[PDB]
Amino acid sequence: MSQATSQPINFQVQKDGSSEKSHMDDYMQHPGKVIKQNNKYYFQTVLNNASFWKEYKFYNANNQELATTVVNDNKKADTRTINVAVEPGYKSLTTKVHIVVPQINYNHRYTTHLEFEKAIPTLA
């Protein structure tokens, strides 16, 4: 068995090398969610046009890997809900994504940074 507690958390995806909004921010839903599940913490986020995201990896500011788990795939809406393993106090994530839109031959790898509105909290 598992027990889980959650609250909303907002964020903005910003450009590599910059504090500017990345257009990647438009491809994730807002706000996200922080979940505490069996004393483990997740940032739960919804990817828009999920079919375009060929690969994605998340890291903390110190380059540690943050495992992801798929919790929903909605074919009709073309969305994917994922949990990203995080820890209380995290303020930003680095993301590396491989985006492919084959009808327009768009095929690119990007690094961005996802900035939480406040640090991931401790939850009860």
Ligand code: COH
């Ligand atoms: C998951 C995020 C994501 C998706 C789904 C996506 C899918 C799509 C898509 C779908 C049909 C279209 C028409 C575009 C069109 C563009 N993308 Co993106 N790209 C995305 C993340 C990026 C990133 C990252 C950049 C680099 C600049 C930035 O905004 O961070 C980018 C840059 C662009 C640029 C160059 C402008 C620049 O500032 O360099 C065009 C044009 N785009 N891309």
